[PDB]
From Swiss-Prot, chain C:
SUPFAM superfamilies: Second domain of Mu2 adaptin subunit (ap50) of ap2 adaptor. It comes from Saccharomyces cerevisiae (strain ATCC 204508 / S288c) (Baker's yeast). Residues 126-396 form the MHD domain. It is found in: Golgi apparatus; Cytoplasmic vesicle membrane. The keyword Mitochondrion does not apply. The lineage of its organism: Eukaryota, Fungi, Dikarya, Ascomycota, Saccharomycotina. Signal peptide: none annotated. Present with 3410 molecules/cell in log phase SD medium. GO terms for cellular component: AP-3 adaptor complex; clathrin adaptor complex; cytoplasmic vesicle; cytoplasmic vesicle membrane; Golgi apparatus. This is AP-3 complex subunit mu.
């Protein structure tokens, strides 16, 4: 189960966090901070993409890849052009499941937001969210098909636009 | 106004996320969920799903509302249905579950894959709470599990998986269907999941594991991914599926790992390396196929990889392999080592100079390995014994930097063994030892090495002509030494002098006499150690020596005999 | 070679470190909660690095030195002390608490450097007021109704704050109230030349700065015996714990007469901490209740939980007046596991006075010497202030 | 290890406080950026120019910075010129300047001999100036130079500066004369003496602290001179700041180790004489002998001083003094009672731990050298409750030192009472053992009570392996001093071993040895013990086996002579019997044979080797 997804821009700013389960918000915040931190230390070429960590590397510093861990929490990072997507999963969700979901998410985002910028993501946080949800649901990514996702997003955009002061 | 509603909802959601009375917000969220706009419905639903936990009245209301929305055509019907279901699923009560199931059941039969997916996911969450509902809905799942749409199937599966986590018994019932779906899926993520599910069912039910294993490995063979490959491997290694019947599966999985390890990505590498090792502990044959892979990983800079390799090297060694490995490690460590010994830098590629890199614990492990390698078979086959001897001396040096004393101990023991074996090399070893001792660096930290050296020399003093320099070394260094060492040195020296005195006759030579005298003075000094035992041990030796001297003064020929005569006498007197 | 100095708090946390020069890289520490405890560590490798350590605790700060190889341990201890003092003068004076250190950690480093610059450790070395502060501490042993001063230690510091214009000299005459006053210890700005200055006299040269003029430690056991002093006031505080107890109660009477304090100047804050051993008896065993303790001029607050009394006497009670602190201890037990025994243990009373003499060093006269005459313009100030502390009175029963 | 350690350290350091000097600029005021200038190049020009400016104040600033840059090895930085300029500026009449300049000089010398020489010349010129404040500092630097070539200079100066009447100058001329001898010794000693003398006789604490730090050096070698000089030093210490006192301690320690003027015949006839005291021969006051050291106002003054310092309320001065008092002492010095009383007083005064431990230790060291002194203080060191395992351990060591015969009972009572009573940790029990051991070494009458106490603890408790190792070592020591109580001690231990077939390797080792050792006293019985051991050796650890051997061996011997004549067997002479002959080759042999065989089966060589020899020698009679 993905318990949360965080999308950050290249300058480490969080932009979206989704939490599929309740977890305590203070914990989520802390985690998001630590993950950000490591990300910063990791190089742009590394950007790590991931930080799995035994807890003890939670942070431990001595070999600075000390990764981050928090025990029971694996952190998967993905860098695309300019956004970073971090997915925090419980120890019971598989890394691949998390990666796939990420990859699919990213592809969709790129298709929908061909150029995503940070500002466009913010405003359209709901749109980004919707896509993320659809993908996720019943734990399940149920359409996997990038063409279906792309359509769905267009449908949602049409809705929100139709509503927009309730939205904008 | 709809835009205002959206705002209210945002605020309520933020309040519910805090840990606030959700019951009070429910009424409002319920009204918003009745707004025709689909976005507002979605946000409302999200809130209620966050809120419902515990309050049953609220839940009941929220349910009624969601139901209405599900029934309404809805025309963005997919989205509305979709959200509502998620929503309902995240609500759990037995009453609600009862309602929801009926709704979900209907929605499972909608055409649109989006809806079907959501519906499935919902029934998952529901079942996560209420088993009776499951029982009733169990049938539908079975029908849905058979829909043509890969995303729907994937969902059905995940759901059955969760339900196994909570109920395994019902699903050990459906396992066959799951096995039939996995056999029909094209999609990698779907395959990956199905694989996990079976792993989950395996912890409960080995029978399933058997049926599914072969479904895994066929799927890995058809998917490329990479994750499906890793997965099959992790599942194989996990369920402990493996058991041996499953070796064949493991093999395929390994072969796929080896192909991948052989991709440049550290994530895939590490994962493979680990999986390899684990398998190797379990299956040496596989390892022999994967030595090459290991050696290549040794040149990788990633500490987890390195450590994983060294651990692999220990169970693989062949002679050609040994020599290669040894040299490679020795070289690496002169070039890979330092970083964490010095700090703890994170790794870099770039410095062209490279920060360089091994932890302290890696170093210790390396040395330990080397020693084992030299002693296995027995490496009667380092062909070049010279290299070993060198390596050992080298390690000792670097470790002096580490301490951890234990490194230093293990190394010493090994050296002793090498010397005992390979009579050639002895002379080389002795010379080096003597030099290392007179180089203070061994004295620092290293009492064990000193103790060993002491032993080696008493034994081999017979090889060495100049048993004088050795002994003048040792005598000068005795004052710098720990009590254990002092005890050892004392004991050795005495063991030696006995050998010399047997050979002295050259003249008796005056030198032997002087050397004895020196040893005596020293031991007297050690008779003043704070530990009574040691003190007594030294005093005994002092007397022993003094004797030999007297004997030499009065004789030469009679010295060996005299020593066996006098020494015991003294010893008994003291003890007596 | 490198030297390094570190300063740690009582809770082993490093507060300051300094490295001088060069290339530079559990039982005692565990114990340091006790205040006295760290002793040496050898970081050691043959780079002899030697280490050494020394630690100094002053005013809650611990100072650790290291040296590299040679210098000797004692040399490192001397450098540590001078550093400590400098830290007191610099920061003005009153405290170097960990909090202060931390905030001033750098100010400490700067000092260290100066000491080393000068090359050498530089070595390590109109109105007048004399404010004698005295902290007594006395270990009494009760035997038979009378408390016999078994040990004690009165520590006097004598500070003096001046306002001359130049540097005249001061003679201070201390009086013995036949207690040979024997060792006054004098501050680096002070001289006590040899019996020229008599044993009762002290000569001090200005600093502008507050200066501790003389510290005096008098071991009460011999003094009191020599002088006959059952402290009738001060220090001998007589606590009478009456057993004849019932299973829950007991009564103890403590009187702190201040007959011998008339010229002892004000007592700024007498604090009495009575410990009822509850450490070895489990506070449930010792539920004790202190019912009434009556001071005529102070305040009592009980801490049962913790197993303690604290009684704080405010400075107004001064002369002849005798604050009597009576009261009753009732050991309430909810367990049966209390056997009605509370080993009654040690009641430490710490007094602080102001303006009086630790040994009886009451300064009876202070005179000025420089070719000066009386009313050549020299006046008497107010508000030197000394402090004195030892450890602590103890009355055993 | 070291890497990580240093890494962390540095980090914290530098960072605090805002890198030293970069923070030094940041907090300057408008003109607060100076720091960053000289930090970010003040520059040599700024320095040189500032030195060539003729104003004593400007020379100061320039001197300060200069000193830093020189220290940094900014290498770029002629230090020769600064050196030169600074040397000329040394001749300025300002004290602050002279001070800095002296500091600088000492720096350069650390790197460069020529400059070292110049700096020395300058110091000579200024030393010949009438200004005593300068002539002083100047002479000081000459002393921190390390060099032997600078001696002929430094001397001519030192001579002129002693011959100056000034107290300041007299302080410094000592520092020099000292750091001088430390190097070019002969040409210089005649003068360097008649000098240091007139000096020491100064009044100013900053002059005394200096001659001290001096005399401490020159004399390492020329101690006859030092004496007549060392006196005022000890007198002075009594009158002085607590810092100036600790210093005098370090010296008084060194001097003594050097002038013990030798005992050589010690004129005990000097006056009122202690061992006697010389005065120096070259002064010839009726040569007053050497041991000067204990009598002579110099040494004696030292001891008395040390005391006052300890009485002086400063714990440092107290610990340090204790160390010095331990070294001088002809034991006649510590018997002083004062040293002890002072220590004990400190102990109770001390609040601080580094101290408590030090105190408890001191008391031990002093008891060692002097027990009879601590006796009135024992009841004082009955343990303080608050204290840890190490403290309770130290209290035990003290009791062990204080034992008189009349007091001993009082002590033992406290101990035994502790072992049984306290919930004493195993570690404490270990020490309590080492003590009681050392106690009996001194008393014989009380030894029995001690041993019995020990054994009773061992026989009974299944004691821990560490404890067993200790006890075994102790029992061994006592047996070594009191062989009469020894026999019982052995039998008692034998039984314990025979029961414990499980014992620890180190225990078996001790237990066995003790029995080798005691066998002389009653090696009639020892065969019984050795028998059990052998029988059970085969199931034991190596070290244990080794000890078991040597101790079979010894046991065998002691009794060869006693066995042999007894063993030279069925020689009749042995069935004849004095006392030991002992049933000898048979009883002992039967034991050794078993032992040897058993040792051979152990891995350790030393065990086997000894076992082999033992058998050979034994066998041959």
């Amino acid at each position: 189960m993905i318990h949360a997804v965080l999308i950050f821009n290249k300058k480490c700013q969080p932009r979206l966090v989704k939490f599929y389960t309740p977890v305590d918000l203070p914990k989520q915040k802390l985690l998001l901070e630590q993950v950000y931190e490591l990300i910063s230390q990791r190089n742009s070429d590394f950007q790590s993409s991931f930080l799995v960590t035994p807890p003890s590397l939670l942070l431990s510093n001595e070999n600075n890849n000390d990764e981050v861990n928090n025990e029971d929490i694996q952190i998967i990072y993905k860098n695309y052009a300019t956004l970073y997507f971090t997915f925090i999963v419980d120890d019971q969700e598989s890394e691949l499941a998390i990666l796939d979901l990420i990859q699919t998410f990213v592809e969709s985002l790129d298709r929908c937001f061909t150029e995503v910028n940070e500002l466009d993501l913010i405003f359209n946080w709901q749109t980004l969210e919707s896509v993320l949800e659809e993908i996720v649901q019943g734990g399940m990514v149920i359409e996997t098909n990038v063409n279906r996702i792309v359509a769905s997003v267009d449908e949602l955009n049409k809705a929100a636009e139709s509503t927009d002061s309730k939205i904008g | 106004d709809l835009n205002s509603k959206t705002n209210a909802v945002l605020k309520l959601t933020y309040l519910e996320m805090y840990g606030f009375d959700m019951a009070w917000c429910n009424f409002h969220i319920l009204e918003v969920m009745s707004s025709n706009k689909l976005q507002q419905k979605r946000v409302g639903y999200l809130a209620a799903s966050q809120s419902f936990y515990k309050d049953s009245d609220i839940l009941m209301l929220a349910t009624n509302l969601l139901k209405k929305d599900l029934k309404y055509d809805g025309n963005n019907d997919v989205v509305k249905v979709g959200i509502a279901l998620s929503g309902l699923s995240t609500i759990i009560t037995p009453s609600l579950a009862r309602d929801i199931a009926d709704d979900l059941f209907t929605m499972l039969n909608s055409t649109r894959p989006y809806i079907r997916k959501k519906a499935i996911t919902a029934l998952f969450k529901v079942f996560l709470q209420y088993p009776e509902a499951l029982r009733d809905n169990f049938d539908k799942f079975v029908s849905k599990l058979d829909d043509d749409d890969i995303s729907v199937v994937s969902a059905a599966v995940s759901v059955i998986c969760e339900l196994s986590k909570k109920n395994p018994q019902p699903f050990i019932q459906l396992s066959p269907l799951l096995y039939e779906i996995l056999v029909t899926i094209d999609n990698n993520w779907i395959i990956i999941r199905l694989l996990k599910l079976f792993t989950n069912l395996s912890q409960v039910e080995p029978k399933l594991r058997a049926k599914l294993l072969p479904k895994i490995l066929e799927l890995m063979e058809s998917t490329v991914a990479t994750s499906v490959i890793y997965e099959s491997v992790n599942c194989i290694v996990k369920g402990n599926m493996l058991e041996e019947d499953d070796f064949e599966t493991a093999m395929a999985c390994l072969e796929r790992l080896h192909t991948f390890c052989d991709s440049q990505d550290p994530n895939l590498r590490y994962i493979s390396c680990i999986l390899f090792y684990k398998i190797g502990k379990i299956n040496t044959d596989f390892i022999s196929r994967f030595d090459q892979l290991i050696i290549r990983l040794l040149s990788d800079v990633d500490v987890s990889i390195r450590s994983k390799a060294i651990e692999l090297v220990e169970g693989i060694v062949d002679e050609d392999n040994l020599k290669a490995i040894v040299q490679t490690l020795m070289k690496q460590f002169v070039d890979e080592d330092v970083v964490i010994l010095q700090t703890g830098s994170i790794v870099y590629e770039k410095s062209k100079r490279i920060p360089i890199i091994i932890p302290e614990n890696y170093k210790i492990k390396m040395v330990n390995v080397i020693i084992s390698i030299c002693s296995a078979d027995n490496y009667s086959s380092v062909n070049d014994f010279e290299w070993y001897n060198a390596v050992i001396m080298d390690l000792a040096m670097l470790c002096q930097d580490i301490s951890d004393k234990s490194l230093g101990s293990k190394i010493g023991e090994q050296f002793r063994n090498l010397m005992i074996k390979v009579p050639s090399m002895r002379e080389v070893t002795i010379a080096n030892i003597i030099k290392l001792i007179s180089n203070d660096n061994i004295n620092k930290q290293l009492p064990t090495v000193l103790r060993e050296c002491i032993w080696c020399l008493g034994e081999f003093s017979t090889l060495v002509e100049n048993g004088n320099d050795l002994i003048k070394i040792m005598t000068e260094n005795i004052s710098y030494y720990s009590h254990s060492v002092q005890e050892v040195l004392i004991l050795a020296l005495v063991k030696v002098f006995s050998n010399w005195c047997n050979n002295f006759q050259e003249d008796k030579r005056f030198e032997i006499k002087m050397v004895l005298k020196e040893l005596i003075e020293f031991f007297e000094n050690l008779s003043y150690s704070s530990t009574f035992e040691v003190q007594e041990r030294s005093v005994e030796v002092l007397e022993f020596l003094r004797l030999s001297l007297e004997a030499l003064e009065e004789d030469t020929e009679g010295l060996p005999m005299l020593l066996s005569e006098v020494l015991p006498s003294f010893f008994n007197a003291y003890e007596l | 070679m490198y030297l390094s100095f570190y300063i740690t708090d009582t809770k082993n946390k490093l507060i300051f470190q300094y490295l001088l020069g060069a290339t530079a890289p559990p039982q005692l520490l565990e114990d340091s909660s006790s205040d006295d405890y760290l002793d040496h560590s050898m970081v050691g490798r043959d780079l002899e690095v030697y280490k050494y350590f020394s630690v100094i605790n002053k005013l809650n700060y611990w100072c650790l030195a290291s040296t590299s190889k040679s210098k000797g341990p004692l040399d490192c201890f001397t450098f540590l002390e001078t550093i400590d003092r400098i830290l007191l003068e610099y920061f003005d004076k009153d405290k170097l608490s960990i909090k202060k250190i931390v905030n001033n950690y750098d100010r400490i480093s700067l000092i260290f450097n100066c000491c080393v610059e000068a090359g050498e450790p530089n070595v390590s070395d109109n109105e007048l007021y004399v404010d004698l502060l005295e902290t007594f501490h006395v270990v009494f042993e009760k035997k038979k109704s009378h408390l016999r001063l078994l040990t004690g230690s009165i520590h006097g510091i004598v500070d003096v704050r001046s306002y001359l214009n130049d540097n005249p000299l001061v003679a201070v005459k201390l009086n013995t109230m036949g207690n040979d006053i024997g060792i006054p210890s004098l501050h680096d700005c002070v001289e006590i030349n040899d019996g020229v200055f008599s044993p009762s006299n002290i000569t001090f040269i200005p600093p502008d700065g507050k200066f501790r003029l003389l510290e005096y430690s008098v071991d009460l056991s011999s003094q009191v015996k020599q002088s006959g002093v059952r402290m009738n006031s001060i220090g001998l505080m007589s606590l009478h714990f009456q057993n004849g107890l019932g299973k829950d109660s007991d009564e103890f009477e403590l009187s702190l007469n201040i007959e011998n304090f008339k010229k002892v100047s004000q007592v700024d804050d007498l604090k009495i901490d009575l410990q009822f051993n509850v450490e070895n008896a489990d506070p449930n065993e010792i539920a004790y209740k202190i019912k009434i303790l009556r001071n005529t001029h102070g305040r009592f607050e009980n801490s049962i939980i913790m197993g303690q009394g604290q009684w704080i006497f405010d400075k107004s009670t001064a002369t002849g007046t005798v604050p009597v602190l009576r009261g009753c201890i009732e050991y309430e037990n909810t367990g049966p596991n209390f056997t009605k025994k509370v080993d009654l243990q040690t009641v430490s009373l710490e007094y602080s006075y102001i303006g009086q003499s630790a040994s009886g060093i009451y300064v009876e006269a202070i005179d000025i010497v420089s070719g000066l005459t009386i009313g050549k313009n020299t006046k008497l100030y107010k508000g030197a202030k000394y402090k004195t502390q030892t450890g602590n009175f103890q009355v055993r029963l | 290890m070291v890497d990580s350690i240093h890494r962390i350290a540095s980090a914290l350091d530098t960072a605090k406080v805002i890198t030293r000097e970069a923070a030094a600029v940041a907090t300057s005021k408008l003109g607060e950026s100076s720091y960053t200038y000289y930090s970010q190049n003040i520059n040599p020009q700024q320095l040189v120019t500032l030195l060539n400016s003729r104003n004593s104040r400007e020379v100061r600033d320039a001197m300060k910075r200069i000193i830093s840059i020189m220290a940094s090895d900014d290498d770029s930085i002629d230090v020769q010129l600064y050196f030169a300029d600074v040397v000329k500026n040394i001749t300025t009449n300002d004290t602050k300047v002279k001070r800095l300049i002296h500091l600088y000089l000492l720096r350069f010398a650390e790197n460069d001999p020529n400059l070292t020489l110049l700096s020395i010349n300058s110091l000579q010129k200024s030393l010949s100036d009438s200004n005593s404040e300068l002539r002083c500092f100047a002479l000081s630097a000459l002393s921190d130079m390390k060099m032997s070539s600078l001696a002929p200079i430094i001397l001519h100066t030192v001579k002129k500066l002693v011959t100056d009447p000034s107290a300041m100058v007299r302080g410094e001329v000592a520092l020099a004369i000292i750091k001088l001898y430390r190097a070019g010794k002969n040409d210089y000693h005649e003068e360097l003496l008649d000098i240091l003398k007139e000096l020491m006789a100064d009044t100013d604490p900053k002059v005394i602290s200096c001659a001290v730090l001096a005399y401490k050096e020159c004399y390492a070698d020329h101690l006859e001179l030092l004496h007549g000089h060392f006196r005022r030093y000890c007198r002075i210490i009594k009158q002085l700041d607590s810092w100036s006192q600790s210093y005098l301690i370090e010296l008084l320690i060194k001097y003594c180790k050097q002038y013990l003027p030798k005992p050589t015949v010690v004129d005990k006839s000097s006056e009122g004489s202690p061992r006697s005291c010389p005065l120096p021969d070259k002064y010839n006051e009726i040569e007053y002998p050497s041991y000067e050291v204990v009598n002579d106002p110099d040494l004696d003054l030292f001891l008395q001083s040390l005391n006052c310092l300890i009485y002086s309320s400063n714990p440092t001065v107290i610990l340090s003094c204790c160390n010095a008092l331990y070294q001088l002492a002809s034991p006649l010095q510590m018997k002083n009672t004062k040293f002890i009383e002072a220590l004990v007083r400190t102990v109770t005064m001390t609040e601080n731990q580094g101290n408590k431990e030090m105190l408890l230790q001191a008391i031990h060291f002093l008891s060692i050298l002097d027990q009879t002194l601590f006796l009135p203080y024992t009841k004082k060191f009955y343990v303080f409750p608050k204290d840890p395992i190490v403290a309770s351990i130290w209290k035990i060591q003290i009791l062990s030192t204080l034992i008189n015969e009349s007091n001993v009972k009082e002590i033992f009572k406290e101990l035994k009472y502790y072992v049984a009573s306290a919930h004493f940790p195993e570690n404490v029990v270990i020490m309590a053992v080492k003590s009681l051991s050392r106690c009996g070494q001194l008393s014989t009458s009380w030894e029995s009570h001690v041993m019995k106490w020990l054994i009773d603890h061992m026989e009974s408790h299944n004691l821990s392996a560490s404890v067993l190792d200790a006890y075994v070592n102790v029992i061994r020591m006592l047996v070594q001093k009191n062989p009469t109580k020894h026999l019982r001690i052995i039998f008692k231990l034998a039984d314990l071993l025979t029961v414990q077939t499980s014992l620890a390797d180190n225990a078996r080792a001790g237990i066995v040895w003790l029995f080798g050792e005691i066998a002389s006293i009653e090696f009639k019985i020892c065969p019984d013990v050795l028998r059990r051991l052998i029988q059970n050796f085969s199931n034991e650890g190596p070290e244990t086996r080794c000890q078991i051997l040597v101790l079979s061996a010894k046991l065998l011997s002691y009794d060869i002579d006693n066995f042999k004549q007894a063993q030279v067997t069925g020689s009749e002479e042995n069935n004849q019997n004095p006392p030991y002959y002992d049933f000898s080759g048979s009883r002992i042999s039967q034991m050794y044979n078993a032992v040897l065989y058993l040792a051979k089966y152990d891995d350790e060589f030393d065990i086997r080797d000894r076992a082999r020899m033992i058998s050979s020698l034994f066998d041959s009679g």
